[PDB]
Amino acid sequence: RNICPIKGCGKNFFSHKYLVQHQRVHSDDRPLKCPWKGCKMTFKWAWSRTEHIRVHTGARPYVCAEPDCGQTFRFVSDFSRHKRKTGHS
DNA sequence: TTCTCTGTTTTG
DNA sequence: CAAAACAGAGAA
Ligand SMILES: [Zn+2]
Ligand SMILES: [Zn+2]
Ligand SMILES: [Zn+2]
């Protein structure tokens, strides 16, 4: 199997490629930058970025497809917890 | 709660 | 295939 060599997280990963990508966890480097003017937030992960951006735009893209629901959510986490505790879609 | 992290799945 | 998106975990 695929295992992180860093003593302290001997975590196991489905792929080797993601074993490489995983290493950013252990660096303090934060390559990805917020694109919003004068915001100094940084990330290691694009998905963090993507979602962070909607705090600036206030967008609420996740829209419940279930009839007589129609709540919306900014982040995926909220939508997944939601259908978990409702069973919609 | 609101928001970020991260491992795996899905997408194009 | 890799980039995007998911799902649920983790911070605050
Ligand atoms: Zn590790
Ligand atoms: Zn920002
Ligand atoms: Zn719903």
Coordinates of N, CA, C and O (backbone and C1' of nucleotides) and ligand atoms in Angstrom, one line a residue:
Chain A
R1 N 0.8 -1.2 0.0 CA 0.0 0.0 0.0 C 0.9 1.2 0.0 O 2.1 1.1 0.1
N2 N 0.3 2.4 -0.1 CA 0.9 3.7 -0.1 C 0.9 4.4 1.2 O -0.1 4.8 1.7
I3 N 2.1 4.7 1.8 CA 2.2 5.2 3.1 C 3.2 6.4 3.2 O 4.3 6.3 2.6
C4 N 2.7 7.4 3.9 CA 3.5 8.6 4.1 C 4.8 8.3 4.9 O 4.7 7.7 6.0
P5 N 6.0 8.7 4.4 CA 7.2 8.4 5.2 C 7.4 9.4 6.4 O 8.2 9.0 7.2
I6 N 6.6 10.4 6.5 CA 6.8 11.3 7.6 C 6.4 10.7 9.0 O 5.2 10.5 9.2
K7 N 7.4 10.5 9.8 CA 7.3 9.9 11.1 C 6.3 10.7 11.9 O 6.6 11.9 12.3
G8 N 5.1 10.2 12.2 CA 4.0 10.9 12.9 C 2.7 10.9 12.2 O 1.7 10.9 12.9
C9 N 2.7 10.8 10.9 CA 1.5 10.4 10.1 C 1.9 9.3 9.2 O 2.6 9.7 8.2
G10 N 1.7 8.1 9.5 CA 2.0 7.0 8.7 C 0.8 6.7 7.9 O 0.4 5.5 7.6
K11 N 0.1 7.8 7.4 CA -1.2 7.7 6.7 C -1.0 6.9 5.4 O 0.1 6.9 4.8
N12 N -2.1 6.3 5.0 CA -2.2 5.4 3.9 C -3.1 6.0 2.8 O -4.2 6.5 3.1
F13 N -2.7 5.9 1.5 CA -3.4 6.6 0.5 C -3.6 5.7 -0.7 O -2.7 5.0 -1.1
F14 N -4.8 5.8 -1.3 CA -5.3 5.1 -2.5 C -4.3 5.0 -3.6 O -4.1 4.0 -4.3
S15 N -3.6 6.2 -3.9 CA -2.7 6.3 -5.0 C -1.3 6.8 -4.6 O -1.2 7.4 -3.6
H16 N -0.4 6.5 -5.4 CA 1.0 7.0 -5.1 C 1.0 8.5 -5.5 O 1.6 9.3 -4.7
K17 N 0.4 8.9 -6.6 CA 0.4 10.3 -7.0 C -0.1 11.2 -5.9 O 0.6 12.2 -5.5
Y18 N -1.2 10.8 -5.3 CA -1.7 11.6 -4.1 C -0.8 11.5 -2.9 O -0.9 12.3 -2.0
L19 N 0.0 10.4 -2.9 CA 1.0 10.4 -1.8 C 2.1 11.5 -1.9 O 2.5 12.1 -1.0
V20 N 2.5 11.8 -3.2 CA 3.3 12.9 -3.4 C 2.5 14.2 -3.1 O 3.0 15.0 -2.3
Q21 N 1.3 14.4 -3.6 CA 0.6 15.6 -3.4 C 0.3 15.9 -1.9 O 0.4 17.1 -1.4
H22 N 0.1 14.8 -1.1 CA -0.1 14.9 0.3 C 1.0 15.6 1.0 O 0.8 16.1 2.1
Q23 N 2.2 15.7 0.4 CA 3.3 16.2 1.2 C 3.2 17.7 1.6 O 3.7 18.1 2.6
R24 N 2.4 18.5 0.8 CA 2.2 19.9 1.1 C 1.7 20.1 2.6 O 2.1 21.1 3.2
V25 N 1.0 19.1 3.1 CA 0.6 19.1 4.5 C 1.7 19.4 5.4 O 1.6 20.0 6.5
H26 N 2.9 18.9 5.1 CA 4.0 19.0 6.0 C 4.9 20.3 5.8 O 5.7 20.6 6.6
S27 N 4.7 20.9 4.6 CA 5.4 22.2 4.4 C 4.5 23.3 4.9 O 3.3 23.2 4.9
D28 N 5.2 24.4 5.3 CA 4.4 25.6 5.6 C 4.2 26.5 4.4 O 3.4 27.4 4.5
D29 N 4.7 26.1 3.3 CA 4.5 26.8 2.0 C 3.0 26.9 1.7 O 2.3 25.9 2.0
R30 N 2.5 28.0 1.2 CA 1.1 28.1 0.9 C 1.0 28.7 -0.5 O 0.5 29.9 -0.7
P31 N 1.4 28.0 -1.6 CA 1.4 28.4 -3.0 C 0.2 29.1 -3.5 O 0.4 30.2 -4.1
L32 N -1.0 28.6 -3.2 CA -2.2 29.3 -3.9 C -2.6 30.5 -3.2 O -2.6 30.6 -1.9
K33 N -2.9 31.5 -3.9 CA -3.2 32.9 -3.4 C -4.7 33.2 -3.6 O -5.2 32.8 -4.7
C34 N -5.3 33.8 -2.7 CA -6.6 34.4 -2.9 C -6.5 35.4 -4.1 O -5.5 36.1 -4.1
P35 N -7.5 35.4 -5.0 CA -7.4 36.3 -6.1 C -8.1 37.7 -5.8 O -8.0 38.6 -6.7
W36 N -8.7 37.8 -4.7 CA -9.4 39.0 -4.4 C -8.5 40.1 -3.9 O -7.6 39.9 -3.1
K37 N -8.7 41.3 -4.5 CA -7.8 42.4 -4.2 C -7.7 42.7 -2.7 O -8.7 42.8 -2.0
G38 N -6.4 42.8 -2.3 CA -6.1 43.1 -0.9 C -6.5 42.1 0.1 O -6.4 42.4 1.3
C39 N -6.8 40.9 -0.3 CA -7.0 39.8 0.6 C -5.7 39.0 0.6 O -5.1 38.7 -0.4
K40 N -5.2 38.7 1.8 CA -3.9 38.1 2.0 C -4.1 36.6 2.4 O -3.0 35.9 2.7
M41 N -5.3 36.0 2.4 CA -5.5 34.6 2.5 C -4.7 33.8 1.5 O -4.6 34.2 0.4
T42 N -4.2 32.6 2.0 CA -3.4 31.7 1.1 C -3.9 30.3 1.3 O -4.6 30.1 2.3
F43 N -3.6 29.4 0.4 CA -4.0 28.0 0.6 C -2.9 27.1 0.1 O -2.0 27.5 -0.6
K44 N -3.1 25.8 0.5 CA -2.4 24.7 -0.1 C -3.3 24.0 -1.1 O -2.7 23.3 -2.0
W45 N -4.6 24.2 -1.0 CA -5.5 23.4 -1.8 C -6.4 24.2 -2.6 O -7.1 25.1 -2.1
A46 N -6.5 23.9 -3.9 CA -7.4 24.6 -4.8 C -8.9 24.6 -4.3 O -9.5 25.6 -4.4
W47 N -9.4 23.5 -3.7 CA -10.7 23.5 -3.4 C -11.0 24.4 -2.2 O -12.1 25.1 -2.2
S48 N -10.1 24.5 -1.2 CA -10.2 25.5 -0.2 C -10.3 26.9 -0.9 O -11.2 27.7 -0.4
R49 N -9.5 27.2 -1.9 CA -9.6 28.5 -2.6 C -10.9 28.7 -3.2 O -11.7 29.5 -2.8
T50 N -11.3 27.9 -4.2 CA -12.6 27.9 -4.8 C -13.7 28.2 -3.8 O -14.6 29.1 -4.1
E51 N -13.7 27.6 -2.6 CA -14.8 27.8 -1.7 C -14.6 29.1 -1.0 O -15.6 29.9 -0.8
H52 N -13.4 29.4 -0.6 CA -13.1 30.7 0.0 C -13.6 31.9 -0.8 O -14.2 32.8 -0.3
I53 N -13.5 31.8 -2.1 CA -13.8 32.8 -3.0 C -15.3 33.2 -2.9 O -15.6 34.4 -2.8
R54 N -16.2 32.2 -2.7 CA -17.6 32.6 -2.5 C -17.9 33.3 -1.2 O -19.0 33.8 -1.0
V55 N -16.9 33.5 -0.3 CA -17.2 34.4 0.9 C -17.1 35.8 0.4 O -17.8 36.7 0.9
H56 N -16.2 36.1 -0.6 CA -16.2 37.4 -1.2 C -17.4 37.6 -2.1 O -18.0 38.7 -2.0
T57 N -17.7 36.6 -3.0 CA -18.8 36.9 -3.9 C -20.2 36.7 -3.3 O -21.2 37.0 -3.9
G58 N -20.2 36.1 -2.1 CA -21.5 35.9 -1.4 C -22.4 34.9 -2.2 O -23.6 34.6 -1.8
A59 N -21.9 34.3 -3.3 CA -22.6 33.3 -4.0 C -23.0 32.1 -3.2 O -22.3 31.7 -2.2
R60 N -24.2 31.6 -3.5 CA -24.7 30.4 -2.9 C -25.1 29.4 -3.9 O -26.3 29.1 -4.0
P61 N -24.1 28.7 -4.5 CA -24.4 27.9 -5.7 C -25.2 26.6 -5.4 O -26.1 26.3 -6.3
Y62 N -25.1 26.0 -4.3 CA -25.7 24.7 -4.0 C -27.2 24.9 -3.7 O -27.5 25.4 -2.6
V63 N -28.0 24.5 -4.6 CA -29.5 24.7 -4.6 C -30.2 23.4 -4.5 O -30.0 22.5 -5.4
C64 N -31.0 23.2 -3.5 CA -31.7 21.9 -3.3 C -32.7 21.6 -4.4 O -33.5 22.4 -4.8
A65 N -32.5 20.4 -5.1 CA -33.3 20.0 -6.2 C -34.7 19.4 -5.8 O -35.5 19.1 -6.7
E66 N -34.8 19.1 -4.5 CA -36.0 18.5 -4.0 C -37.2 19.4 -3.9 O -37.0 20.5 -3.4
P67 N -38.3 19.0 -4.4 CA -39.5 19.9 -4.4 C -40.0 20.2 -2.9 O -39.9 19.4 -2.1
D68 N -40.4 21.5 -2.8 CA -40.7 22.0 -1.4 C -39.5 22.0 -0.5 O -39.7 21.8 0.8
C69 N -38.3 22.1 -1.0 CA -37.2 22.5 -0.1 C -36.7 23.9 -0.4 O -37.1 24.8 0.2
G70 N -35.8 24.0 -1.4 CA -35.3 25.3 -1.8 C -34.5 26.0 -0.8 O -34.5 27.3 -0.8
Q71 N -33.7 25.4 0.1 CA -32.6 26.1 0.7 C -31.4 26.1 -0.2 O -31.3 25.4 -1.2
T72 N -30.4 27.0 0.1 CA -29.2 27.1 -0.6 C -28.0 27.0 0.3 O -28.2 27.3 1.5
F73 N -26.8 26.7 -0.2 CA -25.6 26.6 0.6 C -24.4 27.2 -0.1 O -24.2 27.0 -1.3
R74 N -23.6 27.9 0.7 CA -22.3 28.4 0.1 C -21.3 27.3 -0.1 O -20.6 27.3 -1.1
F75 N -21.2 26.4 0.9 CA -20.2 25.4 0.9 C -20.7 24.0 0.7 O -21.9 23.7 1.1
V76 N -19.9 23.1 0.2 CA -20.3 21.7 -0.1 C -20.7 21.0 1.2 O -21.6 20.2 1.3
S77 N -19.8 21.2 2.2 CA -20.0 20.6 3.5 C -21.4 20.7 4.0 O -22.1 19.7 4.4
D78 N -21.9 21.9 4.0 CA -23.3 22.2 4.4 C -24.3 21.4 3.6 O -25.2 20.8 4.2
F79 N -24.1 21.3 2.3 CA -25.1 20.6 1.4 C -25.1 19.1 1.7 O -26.1 18.4 1.6
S80 N -23.9 18.6 2.0 CA -23.8 17.1 2.2 C -24.3 16.7 3.5 O -25.1 15.8 3.6
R81 N -24.0 17.5 4.6 CA -24.6 17.3 5.9 C -26.1 17.4 5.7 O -26.9 16.6 6.3
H82 N -26.6 18.3 4.8 CA -28.0 18.5 4.6 C -28.7 17.3 4.1 O -29.7 16.8 4.7
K83 N -28.3 16.8 2.9 CA -29.0 15.6 2.4 C -28.8 14.4 3.2 O -29.6 13.6 3.3
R84 N -27.7 14.3 3.9 CA -27.5 13.3 5.0 C -28.7 13.3 6.0 O -29.3 12.3 6.2
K85 N -29.0 14.5 6.6 CA -30.0 14.6 7.6 C -31.4 14.9 7.0 O -32.4 15.0 7.7
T86 N -31.6 14.9 5.6 CA -32.9 14.9 5.0 C -33.2 13.8 4.0 O -34.3 13.3 3.8
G87 N -32.1 13.4 3.3 CA -32.2 12.4 2.2 C -32.7 12.9 0.9 O -33.0 12.1 0.0
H88 N -32.5 14.2 0.7 CA -32.9 14.8 -0.6 C -31.9 14.6 -1.7 O -30.7 14.6 -1.4
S89 N -32.4 14.2 -2.9 CA -31.5 13.8 -4.0 C -30.5 12.7 -3.8 O -30.8 11.5 -3.8
Chain B
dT1 O5' -25.2 25.4 12.6 C5' -25.9 26.5 12.2 C4' -25.1 27.8 12.4 C3' -24.2 28.1 11.2 O3' -24.8 29.1 10.4 C1' -22.9 28.1 13.3
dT2 P -24.4 29.3 9.0 O5' -22.9 29.8 9.1 C5' -22.5 31.0 9.8 C4' -21.1 31.2 9.6 C3' -20.7 31.1 8.1 O3' -19.6 32.0 7.9 C1' -19.4 29.6 9.4
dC3 C1' -15.6 28.5 7.1 C3' -15.1 30.2 5.7 C4' -15.7 30.7 6.9 O3' -13.7 30.3 5.8 C5' -16.7 31.8 6.7 O5' -17.9 31.3 6.4 P -19.1 32.2 6.5
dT4 P -12.7 30.3 4.4 O5' -11.8 29.1 4.7 C5' -11.0 29.1 5.9 C4' -10.3 27.8 6.1 C3' -9.5 27.1 5.0 O3' -8.3 26.6 5.6 C1' -11.0 25.6 5.8
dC5 P -7.3 25.9 4.8 O5' -7.5 24.4 5.1 C5' -7.2 23.9 6.5 C4' -7.3 22.4 6.5 C3' -6.4 21.7 5.5 O3' -5.7 20.7 6.2 C1' -8.7 21.0 5.2
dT6 P -4.5 19.9 5.6 O5' -5.2 18.6 5.0 C5' -6.2 17.9 5.8 C4' -6.8 16.8 4.9 C3' -5.9 16.3 3.8 O3' -6.1 14.9 3.7 C1' -8.1 16.8 3.0
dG7 P -4.8 13.8 3.7 O5' -5.6 12.5 3.2 C5' -6.7 12.0 3.9 C4' -7.7 11.3 3.0 C3' -7.1 10.5 1.8 O3' -8.0 9.4 1.7 C1' -8.6 12.1 1.0
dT8 P -7.7 8.1 0.8 O5' -8.9 8.1 -0.3 C5' -10.2 8.2 0.3 C4' -11.2 8.5 -0.8 C3' -11.1 7.7 -2.1 O3' -12.4 7.2 -2.4 C1' -11.3 10.0 -2.5
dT9 P -12.8 6.4 -3.7 O5' -13.7 7.4 -4.5 C5' -14.8 8.1 -3.8 C4' -15.5 9.0 -4.8 C3' -15.9 8.3 -6.1 O3' -17.2 8.7 -6.4 C1' -14.5 10.3 -6.5
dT10 P -17.9 8.3 -7.8 O5' -17.8 9.6 -8.7 C5' -18.1 10.9 -8.1 C4' -17.9 12.0 -9.1 C3' -18.4 11.6 -10.5 O3' -19.0 12.8 -10.9 C1' -16.1 12.4 -10.5
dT11 P -19.9 12.9 -12.2 O5' -19.0 13.8 -13.1 C5' -18.4 15.0 -12.5 C4' -17.5 15.7 -13.4 C3' -17.8 15.6 -14.9 O3' -17.5 16.9 -15.5 C1' -15.6 14.9 -14.6
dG12 P -18.4 17.6 -16.6 O5' -17.4 18.1 -17.6 C5' -16.2 18.8 -17.1 C4' -15.0 18.5 -18.1 C3' -15.5 18.3 -19.6 O3' -14.6 19.0 -20.5 C1' -14.1 16.5 -18.9
Chain C
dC1 O5' -3.3 8.3 -16.2 C5' -2.5 9.1 -17.1 C4' -2.9 10.6 -17.1 C3' -2.8 11.2 -15.7 O3' -2.0 12.4 -15.8 C1' -5.0 11.5 -16.6
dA2 P -1.4 13.0 -14.5 O5' -2.1 14.3 -14.3 C5' -2.3 15.2 -15.4 C4' -3.5 16.2 -15.1 C3' -3.4 16.8 -13.7 O3' -4.1 18.1 -13.8 C1' -5.4 15.6 -13.9
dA3 P -3.4 19.4 -13.4 O5' -4.6 20.4 -13.4 C5' -5.6 20.4 -14.5 C4' -7.0 20.3 -14.0 C3' -7.3 21.2 -12.8 O3' -8.4 22.1 -13.2 C1' -8.2 19.1 -12.5
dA4 P -9.0 23.2 -12.2 O5' -10.3 22.4 -11.7 C5' -11.2 21.9 -12.6 C4' -12.4 21.3 -12.0 C3' -13.0 22.0 -10.8 O3' -14.4 22.2 -11.0 C1' -12.5 19.8 -10.2
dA5 P -15.3 23.0 -10.0 O5' -16.0 21.8 -9.2 C5' -16.5 20.6 -9.9 C4' -16.8 19.5 -8.9 C3' -17.5 20.0 -7.6 O3' -18.7 19.3 -7.5 C1' -15.6 18.6 -7.1
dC6 P -19.7 19.6 -6.3 O5' -19.6 18.4 -5.3 C5' -19.8 17.1 -5.9 C4' -19.1 16.1 -4.9 C3' -19.8 16.0 -3.5 O3' -20.5 14.8 -3.4 C1' -17.4 15.9 -3.4
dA7 P -21.6 14.6 -2.3 O5' -20.8 14.1 -1.0 C5' -20.0 12.9 -1.0 C4' -19.3 12.8 0.3 C3' -20.1 13.2 1.5 O3' -20.2 12.0 2.3 C1' -18.0 14.3 1.5
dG8 P -21.2 12.1 3.6 O5' -20.2 12.4 4.8 C5' -18.9 11.6 4.9 C4' -17.9 12.4 5.6 C3' -18.3 12.9 7.0 O3' -17.2 12.5 7.9 C1' -17.3 14.6 5.8
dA9 P -17.3 12.6 9.5 O5' -15.9 13.0 9.9 C5' -14.8 12.6 9.1 C4' -13.6 13.5 9.3 C3' -13.6 14.1 10.7 O3' -12.2 14.0 11.2 C1' -13.7 15.9 9.2
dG10 P -11.8 14.8 12.5 O5' -11.4 16.2 11.9 C5' -10.0 16.5 11.4 C4' -9.8 18.0 11.5 C3' -9.8 18.5 12.9 O3' -8.9 19.6 12.9 C1' -11.4 19.7 11.6
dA11 P -8.0 20.0 14.1 O5' -8.1 21.6 14.1 C5' -9.3 22.2 13.5 C4' -9.0 23.7 13.2 C3' -8.9 24.5 14.4 O3' -8.2 25.7 14.1 C1' -11.0 24.8 13.4
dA12 P -7.8 26.8 15.3 O5' -9.0 27.8 15.4 C5' -9.4 28.5 14.2 C4' -10.7 29.2 14.6 C3' -10.8 29.8 16.1 O3' -11.0 31.2 16.0 C1' -12.8 28.5 15.5
Ligands
ZN1 ZN 2.1 12.4 5.8
ZN2 ZN -9.7 36.1 0.0
ZN3 ZN -33.6 20.0 0.6

